UniProtKB/Swiss-Prot annotation:
Organism: Escherichia coli (strain K12)
Gene name of the encoded protein: alkB
Any GO BP annotation: oxidative demethylation
Consequence of changing R147A: No effect on enzyme activity. Decreases affinity for damaged DNA
Keywords, alphabetical: Dioxygenase, DNA damage, DNA repair, Iron, Metal-binding, Oxidoreductase
Protein task: Dioxygenase that repairs alkylated DNA and RNA containing 3-methylcytosine or 1-methyladenine by oxidative demethylation. Has highest activity towards 3-methylcytosine. Has lower activity towards alkylated DNA containing ethenoadenine, and no detectable activity towards 1-methylguanine or 3-methylthymine. Accepts double-stranded and single-stranded substrates. Requires molecular oxygen, alpha-ketoglutarate and iron. Provides extensive resistance to alkylating agents such as MMS and DMS (SN2 agents), but not to MMNG and MNU (SN1 agents).
Protein name per the record: Alpha-ketoglutarate-dependent dioxygenase AlkB
Length: 199
């Protein structure tokens, strides 16, 4: 299916309520904003970050910055619930030495999407990315190392954690338009946390 990927469905179910309270706390310092891609187009996914470094869009491309380009202040600290859940997920996946210094928080409104891309801004591509899904379900689509590779679909639901390691770490991926619906903890959206080793 996906070489190197360890899928832990509903792993973050118990931590969900606290993770959502902490997303709101992070958002009060560094608000969710729809980032502008280097070409001048606003993304449909709303983003923010927590930790020492944060994923951002810039004029010359994409980069990690210790400063929030909107607030001009540092990104909020990595919440304890975030650190604990990532550590437990990474350890269960065979990565006990994984220490993330960045967590990109994505918010998906109904219809929000993320087109095919590779995560290649990190210094060591051998280091995995821990993905945590919360709220409304979304269809995650992935291919291979090159753009013309056949697409495979995977539904990511509330509490689903995937540790993208090995070959899966380099796969082209995205999110199909979020279907409208209801979730008791997020109301009308989906949140996705992606823990990265960026320094
Ligand atoms: O929403 C997701 O599950 C994927 C997010 C993603 O690929 C990213 O922000 O780089
Ligand atoms: Fe990505």
């Amino acid at each position: 299916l996906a070489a190197g990927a360890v899928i832990l469905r509903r792993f973050a179910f118990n931590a969900a309520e606290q993770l959502i309270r902490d997303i709101n706390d992070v958002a009060s310092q560094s608000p969710f904003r729809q980032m502008v891609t280097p070409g001048g187009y606003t993304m449909s996914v709303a983003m923010t970050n927590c930790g020492h470094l944060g994923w951002t869009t810039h004029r010359q491309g994409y980069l990690y910055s210790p400063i929030d380009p909107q607030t001009n202040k540092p990104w909020p600290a990595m919440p304890q619930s975030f650190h604990n859940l990532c550590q437990r997920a990474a350890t269960a996946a065979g990565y006990p030495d994984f220490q993330p210094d960045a967590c990109l928080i994505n918010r998906y409104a109904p219809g929000a999407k993320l087109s095919l891309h590779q995560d290649k801004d990190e210094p060591d591509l051998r280091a995995p990315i821990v993905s945590v899904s919360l709220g409304l379900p979304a269809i995650f689509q992935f291919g291979g190392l090159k753009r013309n590779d056949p697409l495979k679909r995977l539904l990511l639901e509330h509490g689903d954690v995937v540790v993208w390691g090995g070959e899966s770490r380099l796969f082209y991926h995205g999110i199909q338009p979020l279907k409208a619906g209801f979730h008791p903890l997020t109301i009308d959206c989906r949140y996705n946390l992606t823990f990265r080793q960026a320094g």
